[PDB]
Design a protein around this motif. Structure first.
Motif, PDB file in Angstrom:
ATOM      1  N   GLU A 166      -1.732  11.244 -74.306  1.00 62.74           N
ATOM      2  CA  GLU A 166      -2.616  10.714 -75.268  1.00 62.74           C
ATOM      3  C   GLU A 166      -2.433  10.812 -77.171  1.00 62.74           C
ATOM      4  OE1 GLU A 166      -4.320   8.198 -76.945  1.00 62.74           O
ATOM      5  OE2 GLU A 166      -4.700   8.045 -75.149  1.00 62.74           O
ATOM      6  N   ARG A 167      -2.110   9.739 -77.324  1.00 62.79           N
ATOM      7  CA  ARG A 167      -1.940   9.972 -79.058  1.00 62.79           C
ATOM      8  C   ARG A 167      -3.243   9.297 -79.871  1.00 62.79           C
ATOM      9  NH1 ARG A 167       2.592  14.194 -78.845  1.00 62.79           N
ATOM     10  NH2 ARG A 167       3.911  13.164 -77.508  1.00 62.79           N
ATOM     11  N   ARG A 168      -3.660   8.817 -79.564  1.00 61.73           N
ATOM     12  CA  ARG A 168      -5.139   8.643 -80.875  1.00 61.73           C
ATOM     13  C   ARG A 168      -5.947   9.809 -81.033  1.00 61.73           C
ATOM     14  NH1 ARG A 168      -6.682   3.884 -77.661  1.00 61.73           N
ATOM     15  NH2 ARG A 168      -5.984   4.403 -75.762  1.00 61.73           N
ATOM     16  N   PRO A 169      -5.417   9.595 -82.663  1.00 63.76           N
ATOM     17  CA  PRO A 169      -6.435  10.934 -82.325  1.00 63.76           C
ATOM     18  C   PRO A 169      -8.408  10.951 -81.947  1.00 63.76           C
ATOM     19  CG  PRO A 169      -5.279  10.735 -84.521  1.00 63.76           C
ATOM     20  CD  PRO A 169      -4.832   9.521 -83.173  1.00 63.76           C
ATOM     21  N   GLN A 170      -8.572   9.941 -81.850  1.00 64.00           N
ATOM     22  CA  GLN A 170      -9.776   9.594 -81.334  1.00 64.00           C
ATOM     23  C   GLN A 170     -10.371   9.359 -80.223  1.00 64.00           C
ATOM     24  OE1 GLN A 170      -8.466   7.489 -85.074  1.00 64.00           O
ATOM     25  NE2 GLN A 170      -7.459   6.532 -82.719  1.00 64.00           N
ATOM     26  N   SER A 171      -9.436  10.026 -79.584  1.00 63.26           N
ATOM     27  CA  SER A 171      -9.732  10.608 -78.116  1.00 63.26           C
ATOM     28  C   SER A 171      -9.659  12.074 -78.305  1.00 63.26           C
ATOM     29  CB  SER A 171      -8.304  10.199 -77.072  1.00 63.26           C
ATOM     30  OG  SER A 171      -9.109  10.596 -75.511  1.00 63.26           O
ATOM     31  N   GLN A 172     -10.379  12.641 -77.332  1.00 64.32           N
ATOM     32  CA  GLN A 172     -10.935  13.782 -77.118  1.00 64.32           C
ATOM     33  C   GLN A 172      -9.315  14.319 -76.262  1.00 64.32           C
ATOM     34  OE1 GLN A 172     -13.445  16.267 -78.450  1.00 64.32           O
ATOM     35  NE2 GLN A 172     -13.802  13.727 -79.190  1.00 64.32           N
ATOM     36  N   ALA A 173      -8.398  13.650 -75.870  1.00 65.71           N
ATOM     37  CA  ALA A 173      -7.336  13.867 -75.299  1.00 65.71           C
ATOM     38  C   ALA A 173      -6.462  13.768 -75.802  1.00 65.71           C
ATOM     39  CB  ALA A 173      -6.956  13.285 -73.879  1.00 65.71           C
ATOM     40  N   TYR A 174      -6.356  14.076 -77.251  1.00 64.18           N
ATOM     41  CA  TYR A 174      -4.924  13.680 -78.385  1.00 64.18           C
ATOM     42  C   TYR A 174      -4.471  14.822 -78.542  1.00 64.18           C
ATOM     43  CZ  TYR A 174      -2.975  13.389 -83.196  1.00 64.18           C
ATOM     44  OH  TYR A 174      -2.016  13.775 -84.158  1.00 64.18           O
ATOM     45  N   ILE A 175      -2.967  14.864 -78.825  1.00 67.98           N
ATOM     46  CA  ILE A 175      -2.720  15.958 -78.412  1.00 67.98           C
ATOM     47  C   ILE A 175      -1.421  15.586 -79.747  1.00 67.98           C
ATOM     48  CG2 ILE A 175      -0.467  17.175 -77.845  1.00 67.98           C
ATOM     49  CD1 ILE A 175      -1.729  16.827 -75.512  1.00 67.98           C
ATOM     50  N   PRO A 176      -0.659  15.879 -80.648  1.00 69.79           N
ATOM     51  CA  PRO A 176       0.415  14.983 -81.640  1.00 69.79           C
ATOM     52  C   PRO A 176       1.804  16.020 -81.313  1.00 69.79           C
ATOM     53  CG  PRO A 176      -1.073  16.847 -82.789  1.00 69.79           C
ATOM     54  CD  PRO A 176      -1.779  17.174 -80.943  1.00 69.79           C
ATOM     55  N   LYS A 177       2.419  14.840 -81.686  1.00 70.04           N
ATOM     56  CA  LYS A 177       3.832  14.744 -80.987  1.00 70.04           C
ATOM     57  C   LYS A 177       5.123  16.072 -81.119  1.00 70.04           C
ATOM     58  CE  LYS A 177       5.278  10.737 -80.348  1.00 70.04           C
ATOM     59  NZ  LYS A 177       6.200   9.989 -78.832  1.00 70.04           N
ATOM     60  N   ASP A 178       4.110  17.224 -82.537  1.00 71.26           N
ATOM     61  CA  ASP A 178       4.241  18.354 -82.252  1.00 71.26           C
ATOM     62  C   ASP A 178       3.489  19.916 -81.707  1.00 71.26           C
ATOM     63  OD1 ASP A 178       1.742  18.151 -83.956  1.00 71.26           O
ATOM     64  OD2 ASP A 178       2.736  19.732 -85.915  1.00 71.26           O
ATOM     65  N   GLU A 179       3.013  19.151 -80.825  1.00 72.63           N
ATOM     66  CA  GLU A 179       2.015  20.003 -79.403  1.00 72.63           C
ATOM     67  C   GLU A 179       3.059  19.972 -78.302  1.00 72.63           C
ATOM     68  OE1 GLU A 179      -1.469  20.494 -82.622  1.00 72.63           O
ATOM     69  OE2 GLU A 179      -2.401  21.138 -80.487  1.00 72.63           O
ATOM     70  N   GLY A 180       2.460  21.303 -77.256  1.00 74.13           N
ATOM     71  CA  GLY A 180       2.699  20.784 -76.153  1.00 74.13           C
ATOM     72  C   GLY A 180       3.975  21.451 -75.244  1.00 74.13           C
ATOM     73  N   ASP A 181       3.036  22.319 -73.889  1.00 70.79           N
ATOM     74  CA  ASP A 181       4.017  22.849 -73.030  1.00 70.79           C
ATOM     75  C   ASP A 181       5.675  21.545 -72.694  1.00 70.79           C
ATOM     76  OD1 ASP A 181       3.155  25.269 -74.664  1.00 70.79           O
ATOM     77  OD2 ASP A 181       1.605  24.807 -73.181  1.00 70.79           O
TER      78      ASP A 181
END
Ligand SMILES: [Hg+2]
Ligand SMILES: [Hg+2]
Ligand SMILES: [Hg+2]
Ligand SMILES: [Hg+2]
Ligand SMILES: [Hg+2]
Length: 264
Positions: A166-181
């Motif tokens: 999920e890429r929208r900052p309005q969602s609690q599930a948001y993860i930006p493009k520079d995060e994530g394993d």
């Protein structure tokens, strides 16, 4: 308290020979990534049997999905935690439609028509899978750990920017493009009862916040699982051996075993 292992005869581990030269077998937070060739199942079986481990296997089978239960359970009987205590929990809107499948000794099935604390007194670990699947090969105690996720078969070779987080900052599930394993799949996760309840409580609260805010994460449950596992690193990660789709993805050289799969 953990009793001594008995004498066992098995190949010496080879310190100057890697398990695999083709794949990552440990995460940067030192959790094992479970591929065929990393584990000695005899050793692990001994450790878990000595603890009289019980594993709960939970499936939700609603409406037409009840039709998948027979193959799911028959193949679980052939491949899932054989030799260990298993308790299947089938959550369904159609209790009388659950097929009468013959179970091995030490294995039991509860049908719950659609609480929580029931699990803490009945099982040690909870494994949560989708029911439109079948087991094709060993899925055993090598997966068991406080908290595990499974590498989504479409994304294991992808860079993080391609992950369908999920890429929208309005969602609690948001993860930006520079995060994530990794991109974990919603269809196969598990852990100790206490850690699985933590996870599902966290995702249930995040989802209610999103709903109050007029937003639904792009991949629903799976988007929130990925957020949770980013912020609370799993203690094991399962390779895509553990939830493969042969029709969509074939049988690449990197997969030595195809253990559990989507039904075509
Ligand atoms: Hg190895
Ligand atoms: Hg579950
Ligand atoms: Hg979550
Ligand atoms: Hg949820
Ligand atoms: Hg979740």
């Amino acid at each position: 308290f953990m009793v001594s292992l008995p004498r066992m005869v098995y190949p010496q581990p080879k310190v100057l020979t890697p398990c695999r030269k083709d794949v990552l077998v440990v995460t940067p937070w030192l959790a094992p990534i479970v591929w065929e060739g990393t584990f000695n199942i005899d050793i692990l079986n001994e450790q878990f049997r000595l603890q009289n481990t019980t594993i709960g296997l939970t499936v939700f089978a609603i409406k037409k999905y009840v039709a998948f239960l027979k193959l799911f359970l028959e193949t679980a009987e052939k491949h899932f935690m054989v030799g260990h205590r298993v308790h299947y929990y089938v959550f369904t809107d159609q209790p009388a439609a659950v097929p009468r499948v013959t179970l091995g000794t030490g294995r039991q099935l509860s049908v719950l028509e659609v609480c929580e604390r029931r699990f803490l007194s009945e099982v040690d670990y909870l494994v949560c899978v989708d029911v439109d699947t079948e087991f094709r090969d060993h899925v055993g105690v090598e997966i068991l750990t406080p908290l595990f996720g499974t590498l989504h078969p479409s994304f294991y070779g992808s860079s993080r920017e391609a992950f369908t987080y999920e890429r929208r900052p309005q969602s609690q599930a948001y993860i930006p493009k520079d995060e994530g394993d990794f991109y974990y799949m919603g269809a196969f996760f598990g852990g100790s009862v206490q850690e699985v309840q933590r996870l599902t409580r966290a995702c249930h609260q995040a989802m209610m916040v999103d709903q109050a805010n007029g937003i639904e994460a792009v991949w629903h449950d799976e988007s929130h699982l990925n957020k949770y596992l980013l912020r609370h690193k799993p203690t094991k990660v399962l390779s895509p051996e553990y939830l493969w789709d042969q029709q969509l993805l074939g049988w690449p050289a990197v997969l030595r075993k195809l253990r559990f799969t989507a039904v075509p």
